[PDB]
Amino acid sequence: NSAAVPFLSRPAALDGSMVGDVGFDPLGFTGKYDLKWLREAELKHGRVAMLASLGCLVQEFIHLPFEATSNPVASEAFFQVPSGGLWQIFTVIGVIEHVSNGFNMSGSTMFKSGRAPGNLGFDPLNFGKNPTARARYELAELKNGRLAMLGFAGMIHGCFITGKGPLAALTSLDWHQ
Amino acid sequence: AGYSPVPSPDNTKETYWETKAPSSQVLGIGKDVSSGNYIVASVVAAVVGAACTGQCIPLTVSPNPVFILGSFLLPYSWALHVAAWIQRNNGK
Amino acid sequence: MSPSVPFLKRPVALDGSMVGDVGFDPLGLSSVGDIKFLREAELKHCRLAMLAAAGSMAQDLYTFPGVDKVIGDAKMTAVHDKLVSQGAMGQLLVWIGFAEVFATMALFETLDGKRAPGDFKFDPLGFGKNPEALKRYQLAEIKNGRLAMLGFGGMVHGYFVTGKGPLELLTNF
Ligand code: CLA
Ligand code: KC2
Ligand SMILES: CC1=C(C#C/C(C)=C/C=C/C(C)=C/C=C/C=C(C)/C=C/C=C(\C)C#CC2=C(C)C[C@@H](O)CC2(C)C)C(C)(C)C[C@H](O)C1
Ligand SMILES: CC1=C(C#C/C(C)=C/C=C/C(C)=C/C=C/C=C(C)/C=C/C=C(\C)C#CC2=C(C)C[C@@H](O)CC2(C)C)C(C)(C)C[C@H](O)C1
């Protein structure tokens, strides 16, 4: 009954309401966990991974003037960079998390207010005016976030293996070994 | 009398017996196997397990995995022949 | 009864419903367990073994560029052993394990009666629509898979005896 895994029954929780649903839950996580919590996690992972993948790609080509910020490899850059700045980013991200969630950062309490999953109210330029455009943007954001999760995973692991940046690794494939 | 009901696994049947032999639901997946099948299985398992055990009695530092596996048929043959007796006295 | 073995009674579990059912179960292995489970296993083995036989012949005939350097003169299980070190067999194992986790979900559905054994709804080119066709193609699949299980056993064991791949063996003998 699923549309993604045609030989498996459609997950009961997935009924086509949330955007991006193709009836893909072969392992039954939706029955065990709240779908709103799962979608919040999915969109957060996708957004962080989108930012991360663009970050690696831009990092390897554009660098800050300082020597501590001139590593084409993202993995190596993490350690070459000062630790104080990394911890500052950690704390600022934590503050942003707290404020955006409203201090309701738990599985039980996050959606007590009733805000839709993935909606932290961040739309400064107001690009969500048109409802149809907003639906298209929601599906595009989900798809691009999933793509970015997988892509950044590939980038970081290929950086571990090759020891080079993403596109340097891509263009320096060793065809003769 | 106020105790909560005891949960038991799915498809749990009544296996208590005061007859000459249990009800063949005791044999589970092999409930529909024939008594002749159980007899032949028990004899074959006994012979193979005894042979594979004899091939390993003076255990070396590199015993044969297949002989180790087959040696477990001697214990298996006992259950097989018990099942044979159960299945002969239950109509099969 | 038992058309296949005329001197034995027709297997109790086998009623002739399933494709390729000639009442063949001399040892009564269908009485133990669920016949749906055994049919899923049989179709898995059929498809895997016929892929394996075609692959043995095709590796004997052609090899991809640059594989000769890695495997040397290895054939069959020797190729396996050689490329486990390289990592090819590991990647195949990872991806097959993914597919097999999803096939585990499929088997659990089959045992509940939701899924027909061996049906993964994989029909891209759309061959099986004419219910008649699918009914023939199912019999052909079962028969070819059985023949292929036997053929791959023969190929591997001929390699064991002689050290030669199937067609290389057949050429010289
Ligand atoms: C952590 C990230 C994450 C999260 C929280 C979710 C959450 C969700 N996804 Mg999923 N999704 C993700 C990543 C994620 N997704 C990625 C990267 C892709 C691209 C392939 C998709 C593609 C996708 C589609 C196409 C659909 C969903 C849907 C859903 C929803 C229902 C299914 C479910 O319960 O998933 C929960 C899943 C998890 C919590 C992940 C569990 C991971 C396990 C424990 C280990 C995985 C290990 C490794 C990565 C797997 C490979 C192993 C290999 C080495 C052999 C749910 C909101 C459906 C939807 O929209 O429903 C409303 C839907 O149709 N997702
Ligand atoms: C068409 C698709 C294709 C497939 C499916 C495939 C599969 C495998 C497998 C299977 C798991 C292994 C193990 C393997 C190994 C090697 N491949 Mg190969 N390969 C393909 C294509 C090419 C091309 C175009 C080239 C190439 C090469 C090499 C070299 C280099 C050795 C050296 O130069 O020392 C090695 C070791 C390069 C070469 O030298 O070819 C003359 C080269 O250019 N391959 N290749
Ligand atoms: C929130 C919001 C806004 C916004 C916004 C913003 C800033 C949105 C930013 C979105 C971004 C940055 C999206 C990035 C997506 C990246 C992807 C999918 C990467 C995939 C990589 C892959 C597959 C790869 C790879 C690779 C691998 C693995 C290995 C490598 O060797 C090779 C290779 C490179 C090929 C605005 C400002 C408009 C306001 C509005 O009110 C709403
Ligand atoms: C279903 C489906 C599709 C599909 C598909 C695919 C990819 C189907 C593939 C089917 C295959 C690969 C079938 C292979 C059968 C092989 C056999 C029967 C071998 C027997 C060997 C023997 C007897 C032997 C032997 C031998 C022995 C033992 C001794 C040796 O010395 C040599 C010797 C040779 C003599 C498509 C793509 C159309 C799409 C569609 O929408 C869905």
CA distances to B16, B31, C3, C32 from B25, in Å: 10, 6, 31, 12
Residue labelled with tokens 């790609």: A57
Interface contact C102-A8, CB threshold 8 A: yes
- A104 in Cβ contact with A113 (< 8 Å): yes
Tell me whether A8 touches chain C (CB under 8 Å).
yes
State whether residue B64 is helix, strand or coil. Answer: coil
- Based on its alpha-carbon atoms, the radius of gyration of chain B, rounded to whole angstroms, reads 18
Residue labelled with tokens 């696994």: B9
State whether residue B78 is helix, strand or coil. Answer: helix
List the subunits that have 3+ CB pairs under 8 angstroms with B: C
Whether C98 lines ligand 1, by a CB cut-off of 6 Å, is yes
Whether A122 lines ligand 3, by a CB cut-off of 6 Å, is yes
- A25 in Cβ contact with A11 (< 8 Å): yes
Interface contact A7-C109, CB threshold 8 A: yes
Structure tokens at A119: 């909606």
Query: Residue B32 carries which DSSP code?
Result: T
A42: nearest Cα among A54, A53, A29, A32: A29
Structure determined via = cryo-EM
String of DSSP letters for chain A:
--SSSTTSPPPSS--S-STT-SS--TT-HHHHS-HHHHHHHHHHHHHHHHHHHHHHHHHHH---SSGGG--SSHHHHHHHS-HHHHHHHHHHHHHHHHHHHTT--STTTTTSS-PPTT-----TT-TT-SHHHHHHHHHHHHHHHHHHHHHHHHHHHHHHHH-S-HHHHHHT-----
Interface contact B34-C33, CB threshold 8 A: no
Q: C58: exposed, middle or buried (C-beta count within 10 Å: 0-12, 13-18, 19+)?
A: exposed
Residue A36: how many CB atoms within 10 A of its CB? 17
Question: Cα torsion at C9, C14, C16, C20 (round to 10°)?
Answer: -110
Question: Cα torsion at B36, B42, B47, B51 (round to 10°)?
Answer: 150
Tell me whether C125 touches chain B (CB under 8 Å).
no
CA distance linking residue C69 with residue A175, whole number of Å: 13
Tell me whether C26 touches chain B (CB under 8 Å).
no
CA distance linking residue B75 with residue B71, whole number of Å: 8
CA distance linking residue C172 with residue A112, whole number of Å: 78
Contacts of B8 (CB under 8 A, 6+ apart): none
- C12 in Cβ contact with C2 (< 8 Å): no
Smallest CA–CA distance, residue A12 to chain C, in Å, is 14
Tell me the torsion sign for CA atoms C24, C26, C27, C31: positive
- C11 in Cβ contact with C30 (< 8 Å): yes
- Chain B (7-66) residues lying within 8 Å, Cβ to Cβ, of chain C: 29-30, 32-34, 37
A9: chain C residues, CB-CB within 8 Å: 109, 114
Whether C118 lines ligand 4, by a CB cut-off of 6 Å, is no
- Based on its alpha-carbon atoms, the radius of gyration of chain C, rounded to whole angstroms, reads 19
Q: How far is the CA of A62 from the centre of ligand 3 (A)?
A: 16
B24: chain C residues, CB-CB within 8 Å: none
CA distance linking residue C148 with residue B90, whole number of Å: 41
List the subunits that have 3+ CB pairs under 8 angstroms with A: C
CA distance linking residue C107 with residue C102, whole number of Å: 9
Tell me the torsion sign for CA atoms C31, C105, C148, B69: negative
φ, ψ dihedrals at A18, nearest 5°: -65, 140
CA distance linking residue A20 with residue A25, whole number of Å: 12
Structure tokens at C149: 């299980």
C33: nearest Cα among A90, B2, B33: B33
CA distance linking residue A38 with residue A128, whole number of Å: 23
Structure tokens at C132: 């008649």
Smallest CA–CA distance, residue A151 to chain C, in Å, is 18
Tell me whether A6 touches chain C (CB under 8 Å).
yes
A86: nearest Cα among A63, A70, A106, A69: A69
String of DSSP letters for C122-168:
--TT----SHHHHHHHHHHHHHHHHHHHHHHHHHHHHHHHH---HHH
- A118 in Cβ contact with A45 (< 8 Å): no
Residue labelled with tokens 């486990």: C84
φ, ψ dihedrals at C17, nearest 5°: -70, -45
- C16 in Cβ contact with C23 (< 8 Å): yes
CA distance linking residue A67 with residue A80, whole number of Å: 9
String of DSSP letters for C3-71:
SSSTTSPPPSS--S-STT-----TT-TTTSS-HHHHHHHHHHHHHHHHHHHHHHHHHHH---TTHHHHH
Find the helix packing angle between C77-86 and C88-111, rounded to 10°. 110
C42: nearest Cα among C121, C143, C132, C163: C143
Residue identifier of the C-alpha nearest atom 23 of ligand 4: C151
